[PDB]
Amino acid sequence: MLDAFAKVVAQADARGEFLSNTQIDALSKMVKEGNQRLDIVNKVTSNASAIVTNSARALFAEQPQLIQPGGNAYTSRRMAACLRDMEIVLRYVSYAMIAGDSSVLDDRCLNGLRETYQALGTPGSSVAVAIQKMKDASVALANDTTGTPIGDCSSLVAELAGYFDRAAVSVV
């Protein structure tokens, strides 16, 4: 897979030249968020069970179809199949957030997810709410500076929530 440093080298080889000096100080903004990316990982990797409990607490309440006799997640391995599938949409986003792109997100999780739910009959309607119940649950969880100094992180809140909606449109 390729990363956020690699694509401006992938456009330095497939174009074919040396480095422009406007390509070098565009990477200064990557380390203007470089420490500020690193504590954003602490708001999601220290709360791994915390989001996926608090979201599937909510998701069968307004949508009681999943717990019906004859519903989808009925047996306990299918209910454990929800919890192994709710976290990886957040885990590969957590791989995408330390990366800075969505290459490894598309490589190992997303490409092969619309049709895999359709072959199994698990709905594309409600695997997007499992994105959306953890979408607002990490907008609140990462917007607080408990341990780190105070300034501007108004970019990267529109990047990890710039990756959940990428996972939302790649499944419906």
Partner 1 sequence: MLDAFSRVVVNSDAKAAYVGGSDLQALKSFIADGNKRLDAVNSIVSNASCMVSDAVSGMICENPGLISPGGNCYTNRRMAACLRDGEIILRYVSYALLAGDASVLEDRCLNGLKETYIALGVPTNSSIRAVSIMKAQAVAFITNTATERKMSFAAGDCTSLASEVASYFDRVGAAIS
Partner 2 sequence: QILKSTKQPFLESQLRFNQISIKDFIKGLVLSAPFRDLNYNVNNNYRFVEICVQRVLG
Partner 3 sequence: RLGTVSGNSSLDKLGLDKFLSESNRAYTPRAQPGFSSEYEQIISATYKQLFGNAYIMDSERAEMAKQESMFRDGQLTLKDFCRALAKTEQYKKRFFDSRPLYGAIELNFKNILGRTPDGLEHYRAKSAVYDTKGYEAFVDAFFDDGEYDEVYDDYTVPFYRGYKTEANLSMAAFTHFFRMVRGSSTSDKANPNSMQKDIPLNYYGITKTPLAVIAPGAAGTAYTESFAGTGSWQSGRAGLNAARVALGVPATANGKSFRVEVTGYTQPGFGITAGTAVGKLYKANKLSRYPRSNKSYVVGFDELTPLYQRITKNGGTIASITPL
Ligand X SMILES: C=CC1=C(C)[C@@H](Cc2[nH]c(/C=C3N=C(/C=C4\NC(=O)[C@H](C)[C@H]4CC)C(C)=C\3CCC(=O)O)c(CCC(=O)O)c2C)NC1=O
Ligand Y SMILES: CCC1=C(C)/C(=C/C2=NC(=C\c3[nH]c(/C=C4\NC(=O)[C@H](C)[C@H]4CC)c(C)c3CCC(=O)O)/C(CCC(=O)O)=C2C)NC1=O
169 interface partner picked from partner 1, ligand X, ligand Y, none, CB below 5 to 8 A per type:
partner 1
Taking the complex as a whole, how short is the minimal distance between the CB of residue 105 and a copy of itself, in angstroms? 22
CB 4 within 8 A of CB 99: yes
Distance of alpha carbon 30 from alpha carbon 33, whole angstroms? 5
- 167-172, long-range: CB < 8 A, 24+ apart: 167/89, 167/93, 167/105, 167/110, 167/131, 168/128, 168/131, 168/132, 168/135, 170/110, 170/113, 170/114, 171/110, 171/113, 171/114, 171/117, 171/124, 171/127, 171/128, 171/131, 172/114, 172/124, 172/125, 172/128
Select from 14, 18, 75, 152 the one that contacts partner 1 (CB under 8 A): 14
Taking the complex as a whole, how short is the minimal distance between the CB of residue 143 and ligand X, in angstroms? 5
Broken C–N links (> 2.5 Å) in the chain, after residues: none
Select from 45, 46, 68, 143 the one that contacts a copy of itself (CB under 8 A): 68
Contact range with ligand X by CB under 6 A, out of 39-47, 55-63, 109-117, 163-171: 39-47
Residue 68 interacting with partner 1 (CB under 8 A): yes
25 interface partner picked from partner 1, a copy of itself, partner 3, none, CB below 5 to 8 A per type:
none
Binding site for (2R,3E)-phycocyanobilin, by residue number, is 35, 39, 72, 77, 82-88, 153
The binding site for partner 1 (CB under 8 A) comprises: 14-15, 62-65, 68-72, 106, 111, 115, 118-119, 121-126, 128-129, 132, 169, 172
The binding site for partner 2 (CB under 8 A) comprises: 81, 84, 88, 116
